[PDB]
């Protein structure tokens, strides 16, 4: 019995440093994914704005061309449930970053796409002018 | 699993890296070429 | 706002090619296209943007012509599959292909239901992106429906290698090997999947599959249904798996034909 | 049953970063054509600006 | 290869604007800056090839001197943003922030590189009060929580937790916020403001569920607590609790240090 | 669609330079250069390669050395592509060498870095492997870019341990400690970095120098000291006192049964268990 209630102790010790292990890395992904959404803003405001240019390239090339064990056992279940609650909801909260910027990823490949092409399309007229 | 997802997140930092670079040097490429075509056009005219 | 039939019939009418005597005096019909699609664009809609397309091509601004991309989203957009699949088509050509062979292996296999189609696109896509691994899922399920087991199952090795999701793909695996009745690759991969993945090895699905290569050796059906319930209790099985084990099934009933 | 009840919330934990090791993936893929295609972008940039230059000297 | 001094040279020679009768006959100076400018460009490749980061930055410097003067606006920010790496890159902390400084005026990215900029005002020239302003207005600009952790962090050590909580209060409003409020609570404390640190612990119970159940909201209840009943010890235990199972930050030992010395500021007008 | 054959011909006939008298009345090559570039370009996935290499080159002479470098990495990309790996290498060779010499060591770092991959991976050359990694880690840092150089610097360790380079990969091992250290986001990769460290001084036979290592990662970061990997460090390093081979292998297994080791670490410990060996021998 003594033998086994030292067994659970050491158990539920590397359960709580491994939910702690769970914790800070999962405080890092979140960090770096606000971090990451960040730039992939300021991507998005070039591509905005290269929308534009492109749009007032096109007018201009279009006229070029014109022109003791059991107490600690319980503390131990006891953190291993607030970092457990923690982890939890990290999990559920990474999900939803990686769902928006996945869809403003899309529709960042899809304009740098379009724009990739209207410069070709500008540069292609440019030569023959 | 927590760890895996760390490190692919530290990979891709990368790619949001160069991503954020090449957009940036693109638009002032781009903003420069705008500013050719239309002094060109001033001329043309 | 210009009449878009109008713009239309003006372009047309400069789409026309100089021909004989007047080749010899009018310029390079490259402006006349140009101008053609110009107009086509501003009357447009995926008809237009085709059109518009065309002339693209006709005057060598080929990544212009790849309107087809805008002719994709317009048919898409107004529910016409067959013209936006020939759009991602002609646009894949001239191009962006592999996401564009996506698209359009997707539009296959939900729109038209083309499934030989949308595995080529998929496994094209794959084989670019890897110039990968979703559209290698996506081909491998689109095989193992398909009744190419074998294909599947090599599909997910290549998966496995390239992710060493995994844990599902092992599992897929076997069940795929197991739907060919090849049961001592199915082992041979859960062996594999154990020794080389520890988090598969314990894995709820490393059990799964055991019970079934074992339910399938021992010749019975209901021990493999019983192994699908309790396995749907604590994780719900998709209509792949529901396929793939059906096809095992009837394969089990089938030898019990061939038991007499 | 604290015990119990904290194993369920651990293994539903497991599902959703399970979830999320597939979106991460997703967002890689997703991250290594864009950086291409921003490679693209920026090429075509390069190229168009120079172009207009070109011009610009020829109307001049 | 060429002597980047003999460059240098050129470029300088070759940067003197036209004046009196010559500007009669001679055209725009523009190409002269231009040509100018590819030289300092070519001699501050040379280099940085050869590790000499400063007199590469200072190289960037002149080239996007004259490019400025040539009217290519652009293309001098991209020469100051390469002036600021090379100098950051080369030790030299105030180089690099005027470059950032000239990068910022002409983009106005202006946003990206003041936050660089507060970044190197904090760590390498510990200018805190511009490294506060430039977070904060790359979180403007940005608008940005970032930005405005990293502000509402400076001004809350900068003895300004009024305001770092207010910056606290618009990041709980944007969104990170069991934290948040834990913070925001902080200062509110470090301001002697115990009622404003209660009302903002209530908000953060009654808004986010996951906040009421969270060791913060235990931890700032518990810190009102103690503030209130003016027992620096208690204060002092709870935090070792809170330590003792979340590890505390340089931040928080301020915040709460500066509370300590408070509630002995008090025992002395407790005299 | 155009021959790519034919396309391949006339870019060849055009990329002919101008020669002798004709020299004197035919303009700058360089346009001659860039529109053989160009069919090459739309003639070119090992054929793709070819063509995209044909036309970097063209490019080269031409003078545009970053259209050069992009054609270069949609080479490397196709090459990789169609399984030739060396063509691949070669290809991010060029790419490297142009990103370089325009200042672009960004670019240069990190096509170094998949270099290293491909050789670690499909030709198996693990020095340069090395030497690619190490490289990029050093323009990263040049770059400030601490998690990128962290990275290439965890691969250069690695492969330096398990190359019979124990020092070197200590060394590395200490400079991502000292990286990483303060870093809220790094400290389980310090937590292993301590313990790997220790391991390869280990493996060196310097038990004194692993024993330093432990009390320093103890001292300095909380979270090692009472971590799984300090006892395990600390057990392997009196194993290694008492010269108890077996011991060394039941802290081995204990340590398994509750974090999983790697091959890494599996070839670490069995050289250090072969060292008790040879000291057993030395013993005679």
Redesign the interface.
């Known amino acids: 019995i003594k033998f086994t209630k030292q067994s659970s102790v050491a158990s539920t010790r590397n359960t709580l440093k491994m939910a702690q292990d769970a914790e800070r890395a999962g405080m890092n992904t979140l960090g770096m994914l606000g971090h990451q959404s960040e730039q992939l803003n300021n991507v998005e405001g070039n591509l905005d704005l290269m929308k534009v240019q492109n749009k007032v390239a096109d007018e201009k090339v279009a006229e070029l061309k014109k022109l003791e064990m059991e107490l600690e056992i319980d503390r131990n279940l006891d953190q291993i449930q607030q970092v457990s609650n923690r982890l939890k909801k990290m999990a559920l909260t990474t999900g939803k970053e990686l769902d928006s910027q996945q869809k403003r990823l899309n529709n960042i490949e899809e304009s740098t796409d379009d724009l990739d092409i209207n410069l070709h399309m500008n540069t292609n007229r440019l030569a023959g002018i | 699993?927590?760890?895996?997802?760390?490190e692919?997140?530290?990979?891709?930092?990368?790619?949001?890296?160069?991503?954020?670079?090449?957009?940036?040097?693109?638009?002032?490429?781009?903003?420069?070429?705008?500013?050719?075509?239309?002094?060109?056009?001033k001329?043309?005219? | 706002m210009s009449d878009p039939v109008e713009l239309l019939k003006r372009a047309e009418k400069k789409g026309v090619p100089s021909s004989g005597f007047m080749k010899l005096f009018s310029g390079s019909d490259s402006y006349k296209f140009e101008e053609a699609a110009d107009l086509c664009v501003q009357a447009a809609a995926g008809d237009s943007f085709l059109k518009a397309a065309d002339y693209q091509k006709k005057a060598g601004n080929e990544d212009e012509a790849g309107t087809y991309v805008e002719a994709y989203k317009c048919f898409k957009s107004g529910g016409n599959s067959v013209n936006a699949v020939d759009s991602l088509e002609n646009a894949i050509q001239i191009f962006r292909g592999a996401n564009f062979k996506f698209e359009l292996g997707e539009i296959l296999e939900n729109d038209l239901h083309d499934y030989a189609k949308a595995i080529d696109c998929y496994e094209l896509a794959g084989e670019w992106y890897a110039q990968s691994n979703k559209c290698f899922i996506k081909c491998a399920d689109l095989k193992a429906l398909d009744g190419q087991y074998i294909e599947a199952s090599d599909i997910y090795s290549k998966l496995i290698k390239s992710s060493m999701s995994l844990k599902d793909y092992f599992l897929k695996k076997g069940l795929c090997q197991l739907a060919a009745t090849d049961a001592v690759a199915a082992a041979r991969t859960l062996q594999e999947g154990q020794s080389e993945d520890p988090n598969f090895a314990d894995s709820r699905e490393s059990n799964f599959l055991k019970s079934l290569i074992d339910a399938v050796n021992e010749g019975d059906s209901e021990q493999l249904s019983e192994h699908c319930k309790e396995f749907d209790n604590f994780m719900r099985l998709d209509k792949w798996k529901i396929t793939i084990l059906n096809k095992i099934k009837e394969s089990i009933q089938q030898q019990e034909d061939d038991l007499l | 049953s604290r015990t119990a009840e904290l194993q369920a919330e651990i293994d539903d934990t497991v599902g959703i970063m399970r979830d999320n090791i597939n979106k991460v993936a997703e967002r890689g893929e997703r991250l290594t054509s864009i950086e291409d295609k921003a490679d693209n972008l920026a090429v075509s940039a390069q190229g168009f600006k120079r172009g207009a230059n070109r011009v610009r000297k020829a109307m001049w």
């Open positions: 699993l927590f760890n895996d997802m760390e692919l997140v530290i990979e891709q930092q990368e790619n949001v890296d160069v991503i954020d670079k090449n957009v940036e040097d693109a638009q002032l490429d781009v903003e420069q070429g705008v500013g050719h075509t239309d002094k060109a056009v001329s043309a005219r």
